[PDB]
């Protein structure tokens, strides 16, 4: 269906987005989720 010339363009917009999404969600959420489990398990306080 969709031309390979469209799909090789789509791959660029799709990947770039993903790069920014990963960079955001790491600092905004997953950085806290990691320690929140180690607090819940009482591992974290040194």
């Amino acid at each position: 269906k969709y031309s390979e010339e469209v799909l090789d363009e789509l791959r660029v917009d799709l990947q770039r987005r993903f790069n920014y999404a990963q960079g955001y969600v790491d600092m905004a959420v997953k950085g806290y989720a990691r320690e929140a489990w180690e607090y819940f398990y009482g591992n974290l306080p040194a």
Binding site: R16, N19, Y20, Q22, G23, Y24, D26, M27, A28
Partner: protein, 47 residues
């Protein structure tokens, strides 16, 4: 006497500023590298 009513041009308009420039500001990295938010001034990682 002598009413010409042709060259009044009383609009008395000022500057308009509908400019357009073509100074490139692409900066592909800002979109390609990624984005992270840190707290302190210095950061370190291990390898």
């Amino acid at each position: 006497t002598l009413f010409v009513s042709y060259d009044q041009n009383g609009k008395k308009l000022s500057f308009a500023n509908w400019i357009s420039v073509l100074s490139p500001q692409d900066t592909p990295f800002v979109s390609m590298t990624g984005k992270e938010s840190i707290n302190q001034t210095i950061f370190s990682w291990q390898t």
